[PDB]
Amino acid sequence: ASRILLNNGAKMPILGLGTWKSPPGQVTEAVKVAIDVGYRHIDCAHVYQNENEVGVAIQEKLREQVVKREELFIVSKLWCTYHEKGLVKGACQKTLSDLKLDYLDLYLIHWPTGFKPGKEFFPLDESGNVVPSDTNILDTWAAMEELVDEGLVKAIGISNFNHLQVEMILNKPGLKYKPAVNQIECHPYLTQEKLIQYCQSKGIVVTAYSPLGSPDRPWAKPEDPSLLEDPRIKAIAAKHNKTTAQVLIRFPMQRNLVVIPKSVTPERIAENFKVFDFELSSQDMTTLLSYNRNWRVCALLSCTSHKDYPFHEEF
Numbered sequence: 212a213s214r215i216l217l218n219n220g221a222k223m224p225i226l227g228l229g230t231w232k233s234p235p236g237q238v239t240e241a242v243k244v245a246i247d248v249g250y251r252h253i254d255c256a257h258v259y260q261n262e263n264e265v266g267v268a269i270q271e272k273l274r275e276q277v278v279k280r281e282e283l284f285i286v287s288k289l290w291c292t293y294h295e296k297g298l299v300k301g302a303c304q305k306t307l308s309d310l311k312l313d314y315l316d317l318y319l320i321h322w323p324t325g326f327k328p329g330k331e332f333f334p335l336d337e338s339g340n341v342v343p344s345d346t347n348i349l350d351t352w353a354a355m356e357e358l359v360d361e362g363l364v365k366a367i368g369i370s371n372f373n374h375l376q377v378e379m380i381l382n383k384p385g386l387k388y389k390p391a392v393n394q395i396e397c398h399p400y401l402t403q404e405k406l407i408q409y410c411q412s413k414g415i416v417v418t419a420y421s422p423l424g425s426p427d428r429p430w431a432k433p434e435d436p437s438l439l440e441d442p443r444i445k446a447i448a449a450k451h452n453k454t455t456a457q458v459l460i461r462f463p464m465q466r467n468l469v470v471i472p473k474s475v476t477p478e479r480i481a482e483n484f485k486v487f488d489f490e491l492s493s494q495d496m497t498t499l500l501s502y503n504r505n506w507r508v509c510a511l512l513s514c515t516s517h518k519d520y521p522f523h524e525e526f
């Protein structure tokens with residue numbers, strides 16, 4: 212099956228196109244190509260600074276009648292500087308305006324860490340520490356629930372929440388809507404078994420981000436581990452007559468995850484979608500899981516003292 216059922220009753224395509232780091236001059240064509248070759252889920256965020264350009268592509272394909280709005284699954288995320296209850300709606304509305312949509316299929320709290328509101332996405336003190344917000348995440352969640360009730364979003368969820376943070380949302384007094392999704396980093400070097408099992412056991416769908424290990428991350432070092440170049444993964448790919456990237460995308464799919472590889476290269480966008488016609492064996496899956504080394508692409512030193520920093524806990 213190409214979609215997974217969410218706890219709001221909607222179906223979410225298990226493959227989507229990522230857009231973090233997609234240059235604004237290239238992302239419009241990337242999204243157009245993606246839709247042309249079958250993608251029906253785009254992962255966006257205000258902090259990526261390219262939602263207007265993503266929106267241009269979506270709008271053209273809707274106008275062209277290449278795809279109906281009901282067939283698309285568009286995801287965006289509430290940035291850290293908008294956790295205050297009174298800022299949530301405006302942040303969502305700005306994203307809707309940029310994407311040129313009247314609703315989002317899914318809106319995520321991007322990180323559990325709230326930051327001081329202002330123009331800067333990462334407000335810093337004079338010593339380089341991020342400046343936190345005092346807004347309780349449970350209050351941010353209530354504000355997210357209001358978006359469902361106002362028709363701006365069909366589903367709400369969370370991202371980069373650890374198990375205790377997920378539990379805190381699930382245990383919120385007066386909880387109205389459970390989170391539909393937790394979007395987290397996940398790949399063979401950070402397999403996330405514990406957190407995934409917990410989320411799935413609660414009916415929360417997990418989306419795997421950076422499934423290729425984010426080789427274009429700005430802080431990449433030459434000596435870092437590289438999934439795409441791992442000869443063991445290359446060997447599994449060769450056995451199946453697929454590329455290493457295709458194996459890396461298929462892997463989370465077979466764990467009942469959604470996966471959102473990013474590309475702005477038309478040939479790769481197409482390659483990355485050709486993952487529905489082969490199966491990794493259980494042995495392949497266990498072998499890929501065995502490569503776990505708790506290696507994390509996405510975490511910032513500036514945030515490590517924030518009270519809600521998610522990655523101190525084991526999971």
Ligand SMILES: NC(=O)c1ccc[n+]([C@@H]2O[C@H](COP(=O)([O-])OP(=O)(O)OC[C@H]3O[C@@H](n4cnc5c(N)ncnc54)[C@H](OP(=O)(O)O)[C@@H]3O)[C@@H](O)[C@H]2O)c1
Pocket residue numbers: 228229230231232254255321370371394395419420421422423424425426427439456457471472473474475476479480482483509
């Ligand atoms: N919620 C969060 O906090 C969070 C954090 C990180 C990421 N995300 C989401 O997850 C998406 C994916 O993660 P990511 O962008 O970090 O990294 P990724 O999808 O793991 O890797 C993207 C990199 O892989 C390259 N690539 C793509 N397909 C390839 C292929 N078939 N062969 C070889 N190279 C290929 C891309 O190059 P080209 O583009 O040049 O083709 C790009 O450099 C993001 O774009 C974003 O939407 C969310």
Ligand SMILES: O=C(O)CCc1cccc(-c2ccc([N+](=O)[O-])o2)c1
Pocket residue numbers: 231256258321322324508509510511512514515517520521
């Ligand atoms: O958020 C995205 O989707 C991409 C930008 C990014 C990349 C890496 C890290 C953090 C980030 C935001 C907050 C923290 N933190 O460690 O608490 O890290 C944010």
